[PDB]
């Protein structure tokens with residue numbers, strides 16, 4: 001493609017970064033967060049929480065955001081320490097927050113008393129700083145609600161003589177703005193908006209998901225330091241005040257549809273699988289929305305699969321499921337001319353779905369279950385298994401989740417919740433499997449490193465602020481593996497494709513008889529007795545490995561019995577993951593297949609592990625398990 005585009009993609013991502021970060025920085029500044037960390041240099045989160053009477057959950061979201069922007073960092077003892085970048089909070093005009101409430105619709109159409117000349121001028125002086133990232137962060141506060149309103153009124157699609165439907169003053173400001181941004185130019189005759197100008201106009205709708213949370217972000221003060229339920233509580237009408245949902249849904253659909261196409265190869269594979277009669281009959285989408293994905297899947301089957309040639313004899317029935325009756329209605333209308341069924345249901349209640357299906361006469365073992373981008377937005381159910389939750393508490397999970405009081409849900413509680421949620425789904429999944437697309441958060445160390453390349457700084461923040469439940473992509477794959485659900489190699493896709501970070505996974509989960517979980521210190525006695533490719537490992541080395549990476553050694557169990565285990569090392573600025581040990585128990589039926597599945601799972605897990613650029617040892621340890629007797633294992 002073209003050369004200007006690397007710079008242009010950075011700008012538009014930075015704009016969305018600033019749209020969320022500026023409310024956080026401003027609220028933290030006004031409340032004395034940066035001065036508190038000056039008067040005392042090393043404070044833990046709960047000390048900050050106590051002294052500022054803060055909401056620990058939302059405040060954790062802010063601190064993570066500030067750490068990803070390098071305004072602070074955490075010590076070995078998890079204490080927060082300011083950096084030189086933190087002084088940038090003084091450069092930010094705290095009146096910028098007015099723009100989250102400014103009627104840009106009335107400004108265009110000249111029905112407003114006060115314009116935006118000061119901000120346009122601020123933008124032209126690069127916001128009185130030489131930090132290029134900072135200037136773009138502040139621009140995004142202005143440009144995002146402005147660029148969106150310009151397109152909503154078609155003031156940009158006629159790129160010949162832009163702005164002439166506007167009064168002279170309005171025309172002059174906007175012209176000065178775009179010309180200073182390099183978005184427009186005028187050589188002869190009239191004004192013409194350039195490449196970077198068209199780039200921004202074409203991609204505008206992406207910004208609409210971030211922009212739709214402007215009400216929530218305006219009340220950052222209340223989230224961090226007040227009563228957060230005043231931001232979210234819903235009327236008798238039951239309309240959402242924290243987000244403009246209508247713009248959200250539309251902008252979201254336009255993004256999700258990019259990933260719907262990756263289900264095509266899965267669908268085609270499933271419905272080419274011989275024989276026809278053993279294929280699924282029902283395709284059941286939990287959280288169907290407007291039914292876009294169901295419609296696509298049906299057409300792909302009809303046009304591109306063996307199944308599509310014989311629907312007369314072997315019909316397919318599409319089933320949309322949603323907890324919102326309006327969604328069922330739009331879905332029922334979008335699926336015209338497709339054999340379909342719409343029924344109410346909830347992402348947290350697979351048992352009720354199954355009961356509702358049988359009431360319709362649907363044979364449950366003939367269902368392919370699907371969904372996209374819904375598990376992270378489920379109603380949070382607290383863990384019921386307190387023992388396993390307790391065993392989990394010593395793993396170093398970095399999930400940030402906020403409850404209804406704005407209190408921080410401990411990371412191991414959030415993971416245990418996800419595990420128990422997926423277990424409920426696992427108990428109804430059939431031989432046909434579970435097609436599942438999900439979005440995922442990143443760790444701040446990885447976000448820090450890929451600030452220009454990835455959407456995570458703002459996406460993870462507004463997701464956690466709004467009490468949604470993102471996890472890292474490896475945590476999600478582990479939670480599925482703990483309950484027997486494994487993402488099929490041939491179906492899998494992750495995004496971004498070539499950076500060492502995973503924001504989106506496309507999965508075809510299949511239910512298997514075994515589970516995969518993290519090895520812990522409690523497994524060492526059993527581990528010592530396994531057959532082992534390297535000479536028998538002694539307990540201290542297991543302790544060393546378990547201590548430096550508590551969530552990087554995987555073991556496979558079947559009916560409570562250890563079958564196999566793989567330990568790893570993470571090295572080289574945490575960019576390299578390497579296979580370090582391979583253990584099996586050859587007394588377990590089909591152990592060699594299972595050990596091969598575990599090596600396969602470790603590769604997939606390492607592919608989605610935050611920050612991992614390459615995996616070492618796959619060939620060496622594949623050879624060890626593939627030619628087991630010739631490889632001369634110990635203790636076999």
Ligand SMILES: Nc1ncnc2c1ncn2[C@@H]1O[C@H](CSCC[C@H](N)C(=O)O)[C@@H](O)[C@H]1O
Nearest residue numbers: 256287289322323324327345346347372373
């Ligand atoms: N707890 C819940 N149970 C079932 N459906 C839910 C739900 N929460 C939200 N939904 C539905 O899930 C949808 C989220 S928006 C559309 C999501 C769709 N799967 C897609 O990727 O385009 C809404 O239609 C919403 O009503």
Ligand SMILES: CC(C)(C(=O)O)C(=O)O
Nearest residue numbers: 209248252373439463468
């Ligand atoms: C729908 C959307 C944008 C949100 O949660 O606001 C998402 O999950 O990506």
Ligand SMILES: [Mn+2]
Nearest residue numbers: 376377463468
């Ligand atoms: Mn979401």
